[PDB]
Amino acid sequence: EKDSQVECHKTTEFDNHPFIERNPDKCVLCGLCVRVCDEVVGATAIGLVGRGFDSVIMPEFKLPLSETACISCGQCVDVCPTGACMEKQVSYKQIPAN
Amino acid sequence: IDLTLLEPVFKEYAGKAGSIIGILQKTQEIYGYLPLAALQAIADNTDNKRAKIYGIATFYSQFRLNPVGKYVILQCQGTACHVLGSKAIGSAICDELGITPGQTTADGLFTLEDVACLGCCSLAPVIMINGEAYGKLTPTSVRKILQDIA
Amino acid sequence: MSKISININGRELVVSAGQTILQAAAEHGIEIPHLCHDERIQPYGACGLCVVEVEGSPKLVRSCATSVQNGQVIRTDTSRTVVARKTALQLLASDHRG
Amino acid sequence: MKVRVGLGSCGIAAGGRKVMDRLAQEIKNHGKEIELLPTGCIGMCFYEPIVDVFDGDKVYSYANVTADMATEIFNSHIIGGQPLTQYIVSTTEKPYTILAKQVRIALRNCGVIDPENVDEYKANDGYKALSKALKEMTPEEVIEEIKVAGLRGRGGAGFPTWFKWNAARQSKGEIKYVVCNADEGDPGAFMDRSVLEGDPHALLEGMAICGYAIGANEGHIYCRAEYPLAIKRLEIAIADAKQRNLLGKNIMGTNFSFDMKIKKGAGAFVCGEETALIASLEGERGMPRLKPPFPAQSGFWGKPTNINNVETFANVPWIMYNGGSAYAAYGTEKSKGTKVFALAGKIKNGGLVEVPMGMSLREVIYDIGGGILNDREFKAVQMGGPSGGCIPKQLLDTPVDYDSINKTGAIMGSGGMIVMDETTCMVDMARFFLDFTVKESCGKCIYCRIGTKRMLEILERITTGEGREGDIEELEELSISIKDGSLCGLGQTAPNPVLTTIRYFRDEYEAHIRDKKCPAKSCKPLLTYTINQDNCKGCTLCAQKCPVQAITGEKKKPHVIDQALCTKCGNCASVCRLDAVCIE
Amino acid sequence: VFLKALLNLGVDENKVAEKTEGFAELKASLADVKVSEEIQALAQKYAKAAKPLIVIDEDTVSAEAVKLMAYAAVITGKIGAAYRGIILVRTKNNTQGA
Ligand code: SF4
Ligand code: SF4
Ligand code: SF4
Ligand code: SF4
Ligand code: SF4
Ligand code: SF4
Ligand code: FES
Ligand code: FES
Ligand code: FES
Ligand SMILES: [Zn+2]
C-alpha cells in the first residue's frame, strides 16, 4: 500500500523499439543490465544518468534505443529481475503465463 | 560553435587514461558549458564509450549543461552562512532578479547558482560574483551591489 | 584436497574454494535473497538482500561478494538480517508502480 | 622595513588587491626599499585584511584595512614611524591572545611565510626533516617514529596513520602511489584551503617523507577545482621544489626519487571516501566499491596506494624535525598531538583555530572564540560537518578528542565546528544537513538513495507544520536502518544530525508536532504574527507596508492580523516603532 | 578440581548466570578446592583451544562424569554452536533410537 505523502516519479516514456521494452518505474537500480551490456556485449548502448533519486538508466545521450549502438541481443532483458526490461512479443498477443 | 579548439584540446589529451575529467574541464573552460555537439565530438575521436562520457558529465556536481549570463552569482549555502541567514539573502536575490537558482536572466547578464560553501565563513553570509567575494551581507547590501553592477 | 567444509544455518556443507557463500547455498538448496548478483560478472553490492551473519565479523557480510573459507559459521536468518531485508524491501516498494 | 599582507580566499572577500597594490603603488611612489610579502591568513579572519609591519624587532598588526586605510598606514607608520593605535589590536608585547592558547603545528607557517617562495620556508627550518629522514634514517624507522608520535588520521575516522603506512609498505608491488585527499566537501570547513594557500611546502615535504617511508615514487594531490589560488600556489611550489632538487630525481644526492602531480577534482562529497576518490582519479564515475581489497593493498590503478588528508602530511615534518616524543607530549593518552578546527557560526571570533586534544569545548567556544555573538546564550555546536552531530549545552565541558566526541553521538569529521545560539531551531538544522546529504548521495545502495529522501520528507513535514503523530518514531527507525545498511561512510553517518538532535532536543520536535510553534522563531510556516493591543496606538503603519493587507483595524485603534491571509513576510514587524508585534 | 581450574582462568560469569540455573551454588561448592599442576595444564589446554570437542565413551564412563564434563563445557561457553560441544558415542547401534 502507498501513502500520498511519499512520491513515486511517474514517467511519460516513449521507446518504441521493435524488440526491447523499457519501463523506468519498475526499475530497482540493480545495475545488471548496464553491467552486462558493458562488460559482456561491449556495445554500452545504455548507461546511468543522475544522482540519488534522479538516477535513471537510459540510452546514450538520452537518444532512443534504435538510434544508438544497440544490437538487440536481449541480454539486458534476460538478466533483469523485475519488469523494467522486457522482450517483445513473438506470438499474436502475448500474455503473462506460466 | 568552435569544434576546432575542441580539436587542439582533444589532440593534446589523447593518451593518459582517466582523462575524461580533464577533457570536460577544458571543454567547460573554453565554452562556458557543455553543448551536445561538443559532447558528441568528444565521445568520438577518442571513444570513451559514448554513454560513459555522458554519465560522467551528468554526475560530478559541476558540469553546467546550459548557457549562463555575464556575471555568475554563487550564493553560499553552507552551514555557517545558512545559520547567519543565507535564506533571506537568497530570497532577496530571487525577488530582485526574478529568477530561481539554476536559471539565468532574460537579458543574460546574471545567473543564479548554488555552491557547497565559500569557505570564508568568517564573513558569512557570502556571495561570489565572477571571482569577487562579498561577505557580511544583508539583503539591502546585496540589492545595492546588484544595482551597482547593473 | 583438505576439504573446505563450512557450517551454515546449523548444517554442515562440503564446498569448493574460491566460490561465494550464495553459490554454495544455492548448490546445497538454501535460499538467500539476491537482486544484483550474477555469477558470470563481478559483484556489485547494491541491493543488500544477500547479507549473512558470519561468526568473528562484527558487521554483516554480503554473501554475494565473499569467498568461502574453512570452518566458518554462517547464519542467514537471524533477526538483524531479517529486519535489514525488510527495510530494504520496504524502501524498494516505496517507488515501484505497476 | 618589511610588511606582510594577509591575502587569501578570505582577504579577497573583504579587501584584497584593494589594499596590496595600493600599498605597492605607495612603495612605487616613494622608492623606499620595502619588502612587501604575500602571506596567507593567520587565523584571525575576523580582522582581515591582515597587515603586519615590522619596525625593527617589533611587529604591528592594525588590520581591517581599506585602500584609504592603507594610504593612511603608509603615511603614518612606514614613513613617519608613528603607529596608528586606534586600529591596533596586537603587538609584539601584546600578541597572540586567541593565539596564546593555541599550539600551532600544522598552522605554524600560516600567515608567516610567503607560500610562493621556497627561501622563506627554508629560513623557517623547512625541508630539514626531509633531509634528516633521507640521510640519517631508515623507512622502517620512519614508520616507527610515526607510531611513537601516535599519529591518528586527521579525517573523520581517526585511523592510525602508521598502520596505513606499514600496510602500504608490506604490500607487494614494484610501483606504489601516495595520494593526498585535499577534497573536503564539508560546509563550514576550510582548513585545507588555508593550509594549501599558506604552506604548500609542508604538504609537499610530508608527502615526500611518506613516499620515502613506503617506497613510492609518484605522488598525487586530489584538490578541488574550485580552489584556484591553492592550485596556483601548488604549481609555484612544485616548480620551486623541482628547481631546488627537492622533488624529482635524486632528491638531495640520495638514490630515492619522488615526483607528484596535481589532479583537479570535480567537487563531489562522496569522493571524500577513499575508494570513490580512487574511482574519480581513474577518470570514472565516483562511486564507492566493496572492501576488501583495501587501497593499501590494491588502490590506484591496481597498485598499492596510501591515502591521507592534508593535515597529517602537514604535521609530519614538524614531528620529524622535533621527534615523536615531542608530538606525543600534547594531547591525551589515546589522542596525541594537535588538531585544526574551522570555528564559525553564532560566534564572535571566527576563523581557523588550532588546539591540542583534551581541551574542553567550553575553552574553545569561550576562551578563544570569545563567546556567543551578540551576547546571546549558547545552545548547541555542530561538529563533523553535515555528517556530524549537534553537541548541546549540557555537554559543553566534553574534551575535544575522537573517543569523547564519538561517545556523544558526533564525529570529528574534517574539523568543522559551528556555534548555535537559542535563536536557531534544531529541527530546521537537521533538515538542512539531511538535505545536503540527499543532494550529495551517489545513489548506489537502496538505503542512502531512498531512506535519506524519506527522512527529509518527514523533516520537511515537521518544519512546515504538517508533522503527524509518530513522526519521531519513524525518524529513529529509519535512522537506525540507514546507519546499519549503507555501503560507505556517507550513508552510515548520514542520520547523525537527525538522531543526535533528537536525543538532546526532542521537546522541540514535540513543540513542532503537537503545538505547531517553533521555539526559536525560525520556521516561517510555524510563525504567528499578533499585535499587542496594549503597547501600540493605531497608526496603520504596518498595514500600509503589507501588499497582502492581512491587517485590519481603524485609525487610533488596535489592529488585528488575519492569520488566514498572512503570508508571514515580516515587514509588519520591522517598521514597528513601538515593538508591539509579537512573533509566537 | 578441573572445574575450579577452569573457573580460575577467567570465565564469563554473567553469561553463565543468565543461561544457567544454580551457577552461584556450584561456585560456592568449589570455593575451597586446591588445584594441581596436571589439572592446571589440562585446564589451560582446554581454555586456549578455540573449538574444543569432548568425545566420551559411554561404555567406560559413569553418568556423573558426563554431567561434570557438560558443566565444564557450559561454564566456558563452548557448547551450543558449530565445532564446539560434546560428542557422546553409545554402546549399541540404536541406543539413541531406544
Ligand atoms: S539489447 Fe543488448 S546491446 Fe541492446 S541495450 Fe540490451 S544488452 Fe545492450
Ligand atoms: S536490470 Fe532491470 S531492474 Fe536492474 S537496473 Fe537494469 S532495468 Fe533496472
Ligand atoms: S510483477 Fe514485479 S515487475 Fe511486475 S508490477 Fe509487480 S513487482 Fe513490478
Ligand atoms: S551510502 Fe549513499 S553515498 Fe554511499 S554508496 Fe550508498 S548511496 Fe552512495
Ligand atoms: S507579515 Fe507580511 S504578509 Fe503577514 S501581515 Fe505582515 S506584511 Fe502582511
Ligand atoms: S506599527 Fe506597531 S504601533 Fe503601529 S499599528 Fe503596527 S503594531 Fe501598532
Ligand atoms: S560555508 Fe558559507 S562561507 Fe563558508
Ligand atoms: S546480491 Fe546484491 S549485495 Fe549481494
Ligand atoms: S584568508 Fe581569512 S582566515 Fe585565511
Ligand atoms: Zn521551527
Numbering used by the authors:
A (entry chain F): 587 to 684
B (entry chain D): 18 to 167
C (entry chain F): 1 to 98
D (entry chain E): 1 to 584
E (entry chain L): 880 to 977
Paper text:
Here, we present the single-particle cryo-EM structure of the Stn family transhydrogenase from the acetogenic bacterium Sporomusa ovata and functionally dissect its electron transfer pathway. Moreover, StnC contains a NuoG-like domain and a GltD-like NADPH binding domain that resembles the NfnB subunit of the NfnAB complex.
In the structure of the StnABCS1 state, only FAD was present in the StnC subunit but no FMN could be observed in the binding cavity of the StnB subunit. As expected, the StnABCS1 state of the enzyme was found to contain only FAD in StnC subunit, whereas the StnB subunit lacked an FMN despite being homologous to the HydB from the HydABC complex. We reasoned that FMN is only loosely bound in StnB and only a fraction of the protein complex harboured FMN during the protein purification. In StnC we now observe in our structure that either a lysine or a cysteine residue coordinates the proximal [4Fe4S]-cluster in the StnABCS1 or StnABCS2 state, respectively.
